[PDB]
Design a protein around this ligand. Structure first.
Ligand SMILES: Nc1ncnc2c1ncn2[C@@H]1O[C@H](COP(=O)(O)OP(=O)(O)O)[C@@H](O)[C@H]1O
Ligand SMILES: [Ca+2]
Length: 375
């Protein structure tokens, strides 16, 4: 753009599309990736200004809407809303044509084979984007935190991932994937809420369950001990008087839902928490590779933003791992935009040119150009 090539960086997942230009610190355009439709019906003369209420516009006028969620855990429920989602991004906020710049996105690690092509097509065959790359999440983070080896656990909204990374990159044989992440914490809440006598069961209320969560519910440091502290109506109970009108006195639910990350005996599964799946990744590798993975355990995404989390893993991780060392969780001050800031650098370095898919390479290699360059 202007005197230089430049581009647009983009982290999109199951909950927020976070768009910006290139070189930038952290995001500019940001919106929930959802498309809403008018479930309230009746008729019209005056109308609340939309056919598809999208992202921001959507989340703001919740009531009439049946919020068609798309990317639940990297898999999209149906792709049709998605084109309107990205129709926001470029033209409406950023005012830039996709048909002009490079695009950086993120690979929501182990998003299916065909989704790679299907995405690149929406750009290159439908909306002729000049160059693009989708970068594989967890690793980006590492470099922005100034780390080369460590065990990263990156989870935002959609899917849990425990990545061992070193001075050279990981492989499917050791890394893991699980469905128990940030948004599942979000949704989980209502399964449990029943015992007080609440269950925001439907659409608009579904979104209020997310909202409650990120600004008040905290992680149990050691749940079991804290269970008797549920008698202490001070720590726990707090008022959420919904600005509509209904008090949700989120007592024990404020840490009982977080705990499911380290405790799947609460939903019903055999998954161990993210502290044990971290051993699960780390063990599977070569024998000499672990000493510095243990020296830095990178912890990022929307998932690691709750109050009381690094500290937890400090205890828990020691118990079933290798013993010998200075074990240490590195969770950056803002650690959620891990994906984004690591990505920024790549789409600011011109060295990145000895990688990407450029506009004519697609035509010259068909849809498959994505697995002809990448994987
Ligand atoms: N302060 C926070 N504490 C905990 N949960 C948060 C916080 N900020 C956002 N979240 C949750 O993180 C998720 C969105 O994270 P995000 O990184 O934006 O996207 P995604 O991994 O899908 O790419 C949602 O569950 C949202 O509720
Ligand atoms: Ca993400």
């Amino acid at each position: 753009d202007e005197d230089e090539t430049t581009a647009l960086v983009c982290d999109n997942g199951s909950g927020l599309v976070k768009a910006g230009f290139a070189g930038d610190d952290a995001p500019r355009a940001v919106f929930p990736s959802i498309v809403g439709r008018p479930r309230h019906q009746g008729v019209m003369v005056g109308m609340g200004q939309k056919d598809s209420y999208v992202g921001d516009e959507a989340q703001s006028k919740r009531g009439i809407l049946t919020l068609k969620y798309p990317i639940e855990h990297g898999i999209i429920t149906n792709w049709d809303d998605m084109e309107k989602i990205w129709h926001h991004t470029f033209y409406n906020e950023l005012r830039v044509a996709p048909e002009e710049h490079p695009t950086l996105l993120t690979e929501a690690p182990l998003n299916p084979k065909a989704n790679r092509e299907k995405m690149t097509q929406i750009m290159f065959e439908t909306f002729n984007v000049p160059a693009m790359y989708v970068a594989i999440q967890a690793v980006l983070s590492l470099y922005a935190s100034g780390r080369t080896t460590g065990i990263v656990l990156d989870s935002g909204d959609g899917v849990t991932h425990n990545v061992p990374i070193y001075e050279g990159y990981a492989l499917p044989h050791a890394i893991m994937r699980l469905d128990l992440a940030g948004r599942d914490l979000t949704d989980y809440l209502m399964k449990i809420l029943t015992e007080r006598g609440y269950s925001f069961v439907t659409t608009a209320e579904r979104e209020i369950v997310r909202d409650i969560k990120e600004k008040l519910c905290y992680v149990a440091l050691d749940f079991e001990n804290e269970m008797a502290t549920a008698a202490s109506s001070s720590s726990l109970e707090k008022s959420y008087e919904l600005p509509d009108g209904q008090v949700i006195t989120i007592g024990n639910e404020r840490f009982r839902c977080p705990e499911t990350l380290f405790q799947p005996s609460f939903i019903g599964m055999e998954s161990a928490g993210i502290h044990e799946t971290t051993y699960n990744s780390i063990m599977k590798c070569d024998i000499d590779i672990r000493k510095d993975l243990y020296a830095n355990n990178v912890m990022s995404g929307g998932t690691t933003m709750y109050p009381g989390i690094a500290d937890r893993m400090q205890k828990e991780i020691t118990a079933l791992a290798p013993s010998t060392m200075k074990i240490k969780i590195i969770a950056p001050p803002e650690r959620k935009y891990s994906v984004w800031i690591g990505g920024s650098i790549l789409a600011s370095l011109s060295t990145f040119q000895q990688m990407w898919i450029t506009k004519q390479e697609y035509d010259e290699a068909g849809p498959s150009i994505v697995h002809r360059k990448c994987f």
